[PDB]
Amino acid sequence: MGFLSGKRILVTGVASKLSIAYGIAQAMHREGAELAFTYQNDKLKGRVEEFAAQLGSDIVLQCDVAEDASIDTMFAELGKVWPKFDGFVHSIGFAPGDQLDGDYVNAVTREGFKIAHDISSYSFVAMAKACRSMLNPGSALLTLSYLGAERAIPNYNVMGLAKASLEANVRYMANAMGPEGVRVNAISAGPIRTLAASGIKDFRKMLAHCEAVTPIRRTVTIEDVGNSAAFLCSDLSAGISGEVVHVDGGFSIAAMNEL
Amino acid sequence: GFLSGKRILVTGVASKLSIAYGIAQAMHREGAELAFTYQNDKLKGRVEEFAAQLGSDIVLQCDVAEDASIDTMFAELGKVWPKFDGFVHSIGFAPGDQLDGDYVNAVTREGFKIAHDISSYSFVAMAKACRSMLNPGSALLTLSYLGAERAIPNYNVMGLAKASLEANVRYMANAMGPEGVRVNAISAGPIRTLAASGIKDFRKMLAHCEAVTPIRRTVTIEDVGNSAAFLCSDLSAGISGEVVHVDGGFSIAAMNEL
Amino acid sequence: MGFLSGKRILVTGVASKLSIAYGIAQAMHREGAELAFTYQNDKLKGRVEEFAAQLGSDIVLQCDVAEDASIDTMFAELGKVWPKFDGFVHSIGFAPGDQLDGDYVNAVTREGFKIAHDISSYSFVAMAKACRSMLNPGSALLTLSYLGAERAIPNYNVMGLAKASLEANVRYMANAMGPEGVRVNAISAGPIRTLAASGIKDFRKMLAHCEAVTPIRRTVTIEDVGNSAAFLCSDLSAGISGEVVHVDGGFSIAAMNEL
Amino acid sequence: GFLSGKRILVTGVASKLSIAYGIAQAMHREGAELAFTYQNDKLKGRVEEFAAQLGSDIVLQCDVAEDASIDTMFAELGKVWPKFDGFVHSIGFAPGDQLDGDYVNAVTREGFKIAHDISSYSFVAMAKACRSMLNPGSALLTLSYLGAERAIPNYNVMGLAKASLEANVRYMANAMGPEGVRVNAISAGPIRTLAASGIKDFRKMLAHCEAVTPIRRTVTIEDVGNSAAFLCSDLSAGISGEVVHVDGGFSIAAMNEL
Numbered sequence A, C: 001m002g003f004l005s006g007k008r009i010l011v012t013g014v015a016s017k018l019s020i021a022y023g024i025a026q027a028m029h030r031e032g033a034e035l036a037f038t039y040q041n042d043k044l045k046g047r048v049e050e051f052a053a054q055l056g057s058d059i060v061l062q063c064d065v066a067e068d069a070s071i072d073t074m075f076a077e078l079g080k081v082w083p084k085f086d087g088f089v090h091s092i093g094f095a096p097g098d099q100l101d102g103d104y105v106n107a108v109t110r111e112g113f114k115i116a117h118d119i120s121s122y123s124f125v126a127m128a129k130a131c132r133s134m135l136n137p138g139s140a141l142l143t144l145s146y147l148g149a150e151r152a153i154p155n156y157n158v159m160g161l162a163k164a165s166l167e168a169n170v171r172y173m174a175n176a177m178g179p180e181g182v183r184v185n186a187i188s189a190g191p192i193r194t195l196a197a198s199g200i201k202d203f204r205k206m207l208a209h210c211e212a213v214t215p216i217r218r219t220v221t222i223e224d225v226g227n228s229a230a231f232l233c234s235d236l237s238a239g240i241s242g243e244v245v246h247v248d249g250g251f252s253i254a255a256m257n258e259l
Numbered sequence B, D: 001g002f003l004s005g006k007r008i009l010v011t012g013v014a015s016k017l018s019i020a021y022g023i024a025q026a027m028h029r030e031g032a033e034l035a036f037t038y039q040n041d042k043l044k045g046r047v048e049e050f051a052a053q054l055g056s057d058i059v060l061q062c063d064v065a066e067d068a069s070i071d072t073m074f075a076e077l078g079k080v081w082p083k084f085d086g087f088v089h090s091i092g093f094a095p096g097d098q099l100d101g102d103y104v105n106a107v108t109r110e111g112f113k114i115a116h117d118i119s120s121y122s123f124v125a126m127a128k129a130c131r132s133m134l135n136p137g138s139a140l141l142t143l144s145y146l147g148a149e150r151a152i153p154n155y156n157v158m159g160l161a162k163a164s165l166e167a168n169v170r171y172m173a174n175a176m177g178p179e180g181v182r183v184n185a186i187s188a189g190p191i192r193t194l195a196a197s198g199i200k201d202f203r204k205m206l207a208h209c210e211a212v213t214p215i216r217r218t219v220t221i222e223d224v225g226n227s228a229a230f231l232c233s234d235l236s237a238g239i240s241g242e243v244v245h246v247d248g249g250f251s252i253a254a255m256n257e258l
C-alpha cells in the first residue's frame, strides 16, 4: 500500500490536465489516498468529474471560495460521505488579469488588491475554518505559493503581496491548529506552463531563463510538485509544519548564474 | 541636520506615544520640513497642535480607506509643496475582534479585508497618488512588525497584513527605483502606544522582550525615529526594498529564556 | 517496493541507536535502499557493523573526516563493491566541548572555531569532492543542520557559525553539482536527545520548552527526521535542491508562544 | 556630526578604493575620532598617510591571523584610548585559487580554513581582545556579501565564510548586548575595489547589477560609508544582530533581466 493509505484528502483547483492540482491528485492517488475534488463553477463540472473518476473518486463538489456560503455548502455535502477526513490541498490563486502586466505601482488598484488577497490568501484559512471540526488528528493542509512572495518579480505585481499574505497564513494556521493535530505547509513551486500562464507575456522566455540558471538545469513539473505535495500531506512529514518548501529546482538559492 | 532640505509628509500621528510622533520629532531635529495628515475630525486638533510645535502649518485630512481622500489630500499638499521628498506611512489597523484568541477562529473575510486594505494597500495607494510629485532622491517608509515573519499569538490577521506590506515594500522599491525613489520598512519591536489598546498580556509581552532582547530593553519611539530619519535621508542612498529590524535584536535570538 | 528501491546510499554518523543517522538508516532501509555505513574510529567498529547487518548491509568502513586520506581510502574501499552509488547522508557535527558552555565571546577560541568548522562544515564538501565521480545521475546528498545557524542560541556558540557555514555549503554544492545530476539539501532538525546532548546543561528544560511552544506540541524524533531524510534522498524530491528543510515541528516559525 | 564624541578603530584600509576608506571618511565627516590598523609592512605607509589626512596619529599593525598581533595592537591602542566606542572590521580573504571555477573542485581544506579564519573568526577574535575596553553604547560593524545567502558563481568558499560571519554577528550581538555593545553587519553590493583583483568577469557582473538593481546603479564606498557611520552611531541604538543590505535593492529582485 502507498504512503497515503487510509487518508482521505480533498483537492481543489483542478482546471485541466496541466493544473498543479492535477499532478498532486495523480501522485496522491498513486500513493493510495482516497480523493475528493472541488470545482469553481459549472464550466468545470463535467471535466473535473472525469478527472476524479479516473482517480477512483465519486466525490466532485462545487466550491467558489469567494463566497462563505459556497464553502459551507460544499463541506456540508462532503460530510455526508466523509464525516471526517485528513486535510485538503489549496491550489487556488487569482488576480484580475490587468493587475499582472506592467509597472506594479501603476497597475495595482484597491479592488485588484482586494480580490487577489481574498481569493489567493483568505480562502485558504476560510476553507480551514469551515472544515476544522471534520479533520482527524494527523491531518495536513497544503497550499501553493511562488517566489514572488519573497522577491519583487516583474509583472507578478499584486499577486506577490497576496502570496506573501498566504505564506504568513501558513504560519498562523500551523500555529493555531497544530495543538489539535493538524499540520499546515506550502510548496513554493517554480514556474509551470499551466492555465495560470495564460496571457502572461514573456512566459516562454521566462521558463528558458529558469531552465538556464536553476541548479538542476530544468524547470519543475506538476509531477515534481505532486510528489512533494503527497509527501507533505502524508505522515512521512509528521515533523514539518508551518514550512514553505521550495520545489523550484534550487532556482531561488542561486544568483548571477546568468553570467 | 542630515535631513536639511528635505520635505517629508508624516501620517499616523495619534498621540505623543505614536511611533510617527517619534519619527516626526527626530526628523524635525535633523532639519526636515514636515507636513502632517490626520485620519478624521477626532484627531485634527491634536495633530494641528503637534504640527505647530514642530513649526509646520501643513495639516491635512486623509483617510486611507478612500481613494478620493488620498487624492484630495495630495491635491491640497501640492498647493504648498508642488514636489516633495517622500512620506512616512505609520498606519496599521484591524477590527479589534480580530486580535484576540485562536487565529483561525477569530479571522473573518471582512476582518481580513480591512486589515490588508488599511495596513498594506494604503501604502501603495499613497505612492500612486503622489508619484509625479516625488523628487529624485525621494524615500518612502512604512512600519512593520515581526508578526509578518513569525506566528505570534493574538496578532492574528495583522501578521498576514504585515507580510503583504513587506512584499509591497519590495514591489514598490522595484517599480519606483528607476525614477529615483527608495522604499523601505522598519520592523519595530513592541512599543506601548495606542496600538496596544485592548491587547491581552501586552505588559507580559514587553517584560518578555525586555528579558530576551540582546540590548536588554525594549525599543522606544526615539529609537525608531532615529532609524526612520536615516532611512528617509540621503545617508541611506544605498538601501532600498529593505525591512530593517529596529527591535534591539529580539528577532535574532532563540531560547534565550532558559 | 519502497520509494528508495534501486538506490545505494552511504550513511555516516551512526554512533548509537539514538543517533539521527540511525533513524535515517532505518527509514531508508524500510523504503528499500541498499545501505553502506561509515564509523569514526575503532571504538565504534563493532556496533556500527551490528547496526549495518540488521539493515541488510555488509559494507562498514572507517572514516574520520578530519583527514583527507581517510575519506579517500574509504571511498576507494566503497568503490570495490559500489563502483557507483546514489548519494550519502552527512550526519557529523563536532566542536570541542568547552566551546559549548557559557558566554560565546568568552568561550570561543581560534582552535575551537577551526575544528567546529572543519568537522561540521568542510567535511560535507570534502566527502562530495572525494566521491563526485562515483555518483549516478539522480543522486542526492543530505546533511543535518540546526536552528542555531539562523538564530543566536545560548551555549550553542561556535557550532551556530559552523552550521551557518554548512547551510551555505548546501547551496554552493547544490549549485555546482546540480548540472551533472546531483541534488544537495539539509534538514534543520529540532533538538533530539542523542549523544550530541551529552554534557549540554539544561537539555531537559530545553526539550520541555520546545515541547510547549512547538506548533505540534511535541519534540521531533529520529523517526520524523528519518522519514523526511528518506524523502529528500529519493526521487520523490527531484524538484528540491539547495534547500534547508525545517523538521522541527514548526518551532522556528512561532514566537512568544511562551506567554 | 552624529558621531561626535565617539572613538572608532577602523581596520582594512588598503587603498582609496577600500570600503574601509569610505567608512573612515564618512565617520570623520560626522565627527568621530579615528584610529587605524594595517595588515603588514607593505601597507603601513599608505595607512599612515590616509590617517594623517583624517587627523589621526593612531596607526597600529594588526594581522588578524595571529592572536598575539591582535593583543599587542589593543595593548598599544589602550595607551592612547583606554576605552573606546567600537571598531569596523573590513577584512575578508581566501587564497585566490579558491575563487575561480566550480566550487566543489576549487575548495580545499586549507583554503576553507583560511577563508573562515581570516574572514569570520577574526571578527570575534578582535571583540575578545578589546571587550573590557568598550564603553557602554559601543558598536561593532563588519562587512558581508550576498554570497552568504545565495550561491554565486566563483565566490565559492568565501560564501561559506560570510555565512559564518553573519552568524558571528548574531552570536556576538546576543553575548555582548547586555554589556551595552551592539554588533551588526552591512551586506554591501559589489564594488570594484582591490577585492575584485583577478576576479573573472567582475565588470560583466557590475553591468548586470547596474541593470537589475532597483536604484539602477551599483553602490559606492560613499553609500556604504554613510550606512556604516549610522550603524556605529547612537542613532542606530535600536539595531543589533542585523545584516543591513546596502546593495541598492539588488537582493530583493528576481528575473528583472527578462
Ligand SMILES: NC(=O)c1ccc[n+]([C@@H]2O[C@H](COP(=O)([O-])OP(=O)(O)OC[C@H]3O[C@@H](n4cnc5c(N)ncnc54)[C@H](O)[C@@H]3O)[C@@H](O)[C@H]2O)c1
Binding pocket: A012, A013, A014, A015, A016, A018, A019, A020, A021, A039, A040, A063, A064, A065, A066, A091, A092, A093, A094, A119, A144, A145, A146, A188, A189, A190, A191, A192, A193, A194, A195, A196, A197
Ligand atoms: N503555474 C505556476 O507557474 C505556479 C507556480 C507556483 C505557484 N502557482 C500557484 O499554484 C496554484 C495552482 O495554479 P495552476 O498553475 O495549477 O493554474 P490553474 O489555473 O490550473 O489552477 C488555478 C485554479 O484556481 C481555481 N480558482 C480560481 N478562482 C477560484 C475561486 N474563486 N474559487 C474556487 N477556485 C478558484 C481555478 O478554477 C483553477 O482550478 C495557484 O495558487 C498558483 O498561484 C502556480
Ligand SMILES: NC(=O)c1ccc[n+]([C@@H]2O[C@H](COP(=O)([O-])OP(=O)(O)OC[C@H]3O[C@@H](n4cnc5c(N)ncnc54)[C@H](O)[C@@H]3O)[C@@H](O)[C@H]2O)c1
Binding pocket: B011, B012, B013, B014, B015, B017, B018, B019, B020, B038, B039, B043, B062, B063, B064, B065, B090, B091, B092, B093, B118, B143, B144, B145, B187, B188, B189, B190, B191, B192, B193, B194, B195, B196
Ligand atoms: N506599537 C507597536 O508595538 C508597533 C510595533 C511595530 C509596528 N507597529 C506599526 O506602527 C504603526 C504606527 O502604530 P503606533 O504604534 O504608532 O499606534 P497609533 O495608534 O499611535 O498609530 C496608528 C495610526 O494609524 C492611523 N490610522 C488607522 N486607520 C487609518 C485610516 N483608515 N486612515 C488614516 N490613518 C489611519 C491612526 O489614526 C493612527 O494615527 C502601525 O502600522 C503599527 O502596525 C507598531
Ligand SMILES: NC(=O)c1ccc[n+]([C@@H]2O[C@H](COP(=O)([O-])OP(=O)(O)OC[C@H]3O[C@@H](n4cnc5c(N)ncnc54)[C@H](O)[C@@H]3O)[C@@H](O)[C@H]2O)c1
Binding pocket: C012, C013, C014, C015, C016, C018, C019, C020, C021, C039, C040, C063, C064, C065, C066, C091, C092, C093, C094, C119, C144, C145, C146, C188, C189, C190, C191, C192, C193, C194, C195, C196, C197
Ligand atoms: N541531536 C540534536 O538535537 C540535533 C538537532 C539538529 C542537528 N543535529 C546534528 O545532527 C547530526 C548528527 O548528530 P546526532 O544528534 O545524531 O548525535 P551523534 O553524536 O549520535 O552523531 C554525531 C556523529 O558525528 C560523528 N563524528 C564526529 N566527529 C567525526 C569525525 N571526525 N569523523 C567522522 N565522524 C565524526 C560521530 O562519530 C557521531 O557518529 C550532527 O551534525 C548534529 O549537529 C543534532
Ligand SMILES: NC(=O)c1ccc[n+]([C@@H]2O[C@H](COP(=O)([O-])OP(=O)(O)OC[C@H]3O[C@@H](n4cnc5c(N)ncnc54)[C@H](O)[C@@H]3O)[C@@H](O)[C@H]2O)c1
Binding pocket: D011, D012, D013, D014, D015, D017, D018, D019, D020, D038, D039, D043, D062, D063, D064, D065, D090, D091, D092, D093, D118, D143, D144, D145, D187, D188, D189, D190, D191, D192, D193, D194, D195, D196
Ligand atoms: N568589494 C566588494 O564588492 C565587497 C562587497 C561586500 C563585502 N565586501 C567585503 O568588504 C571587506 C573590505 O573589502 P574591500 O572591498 O574594501 O577590499 P580591500 O582589499 O580594499 O580590503 C580588504 C582588506 O582586508 C585586509 N586583510 C586581509 N587579510 C588580513 C589579515 N590577515 N589581517 C588584517 N587585515 C587583513 C586587507 O589588508 C585589506 O585592507 C571584505 O570583508 C570584503 O569581503 C566587499
Ligand SMILES: Cc1c(CN(C)C(=O)/C=C/c2cnc3c(c2)CC[C@@H](N)C(=O)N3)oc2ccccc12
Binding pocket: A093, A094, A095, A096, A097, A100, A146, A153, A154, A155, A156, A157, A159, A191, A192, A195, A196, A197, A198, A199, A200
Ligand atoms: C510565474 C508567473 C505566474 C504563474 N503563477 C506563479 C501564478 O501564481 C499565476 C497566478 C495568476 C493569477 N491570476 C491570473 C493569472 C495568473 C492569469 C490567468 C487568468 N487566470 C487571470 O485572469 N488571472 O503568473 C505570473 C504573472 C506575472 C509574472 C510571472 C508569473
Ligand SMILES: Cc1c(CN(C)C(=O)/C=C/c2cnc3c(c2)CC[C@@H](N)C(=O)N3)oc2ccccc12
Binding pocket: B092, B093, B094, B095, B096, B099, B145, B152, B153, B154, B155, B156, B158, B190, B191, B194, B195, B196, B197, B198, B199
Ligand atoms: C505587539 C502587538 C501589537 C502592536 N502592533 C505591532 C501593531 O501592529 C498593532 C496593530 C493594531 C491594529 N489594529 C488594532 C489594534 C492594533 C488595537 C487597537 C485598536 N486600534 C484596534 O481596534 N485595532 O498589537 C498586537 C496585537 C496582538 C498581539 C501582539 C501585538
Ligand SMILES: Cc1c(CN(C)C(=O)/C=C/c2cnc3c(c2)CC[C@@H](N)C(=O)N3)oc2ccccc12
Binding pocket: C093, C094, C095, C096, C097, C100, C146, C153, C154, C155, C156, C157, C159, C191, C192, C195, C196, C197, C198, C199, C200
Ligand atoms: C540543541 C543543542 C545541541 C544538539 N545539536 C543541535 C548539536 O548540533 C550538537 C552538537 C555537538 C557538537 N559537539 C559536541 C557536542 C554536541 C557535545 C557532545 C560531545 N560530542 C562534544 O564534545 N562536542 O547541542 C547543543 C549545545 C549547546 C546548546 C544547545 C544544543
Ligand SMILES: Cc1c(CN(C)C(=O)/C=C/c2cnc3c(c2)CC[C@@H](N)C(=O)N3)oc2ccccc12
Binding pocket: D092, D093, D094, D095, D096, D099, D145, D152, D153, D154, D155, D156, D158, D190, D191, D194, D195, D196, D197, D198, D199
Ligand atoms: C563580488 C565579488 C567579490 C568581492 N567581494 C564581495 C569579496 O568579498 C572579495 C573577497 C576576496 C577574498 N580574498 C581574495 C579576493 C577577494 C581576491 C583578491 C585577492 N585579495 C585574493 O587573493 N583573495 O569577490 C568575488 C569573487 C568571486 C565572485 C564574485 C566576487
